[PDB]
Design a protein around this ligand. Sequence first.
Ligand code: A1B3V
Ligand code: ZN
Length: 139
Amino acid sequence: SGAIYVGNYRVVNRHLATHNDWANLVWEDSSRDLLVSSTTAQGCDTIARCDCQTGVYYCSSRRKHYPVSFSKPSLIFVEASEYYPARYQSHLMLAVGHSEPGDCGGILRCQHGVVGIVSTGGNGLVGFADVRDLLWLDE
Ligand SMILES: CSc1ccncc1CC(=O)N1CCC[C@H](C(N)=O)C1
Ligand SMILES: [Zn+2]
């Protein structure tokens, strides 16, 4: 679990969005596993606007942060799950690191701000949904 709180927006994994997220929907994209909902309170986070390929992510299944080198956002095949059929997930970045299903939502940050959130994983890999291209989050 986990979310990014920026301005009057809450960014979550689309597969973990609540009834309230859907009732206050701003934008969602099944191909990216992202959903953004509106909030009444002003958020705590800054979004990176950069091309970093190194950063640190929070891994809830270890209660620890780990440094990672990750690939640029791209279209990556993701196996079928209870949430989605087998498909290509876009804007996904992979890295070697521990993750388990419940780790989705963990933030990936570089020196410039929030890069994205944990969205996929398996066998010593971890995938992050990028949010750096969503320029409207800052306005
Ligand atoms: C950190 S998720 C994870 C980690 C390790 N083994 C498995 C997983 C689960 C996982 O990859 N997905 C299930 C939930 C929806 C995901 C998606 N974006 O399509 C895919
Ligand atoms: Zn950066």
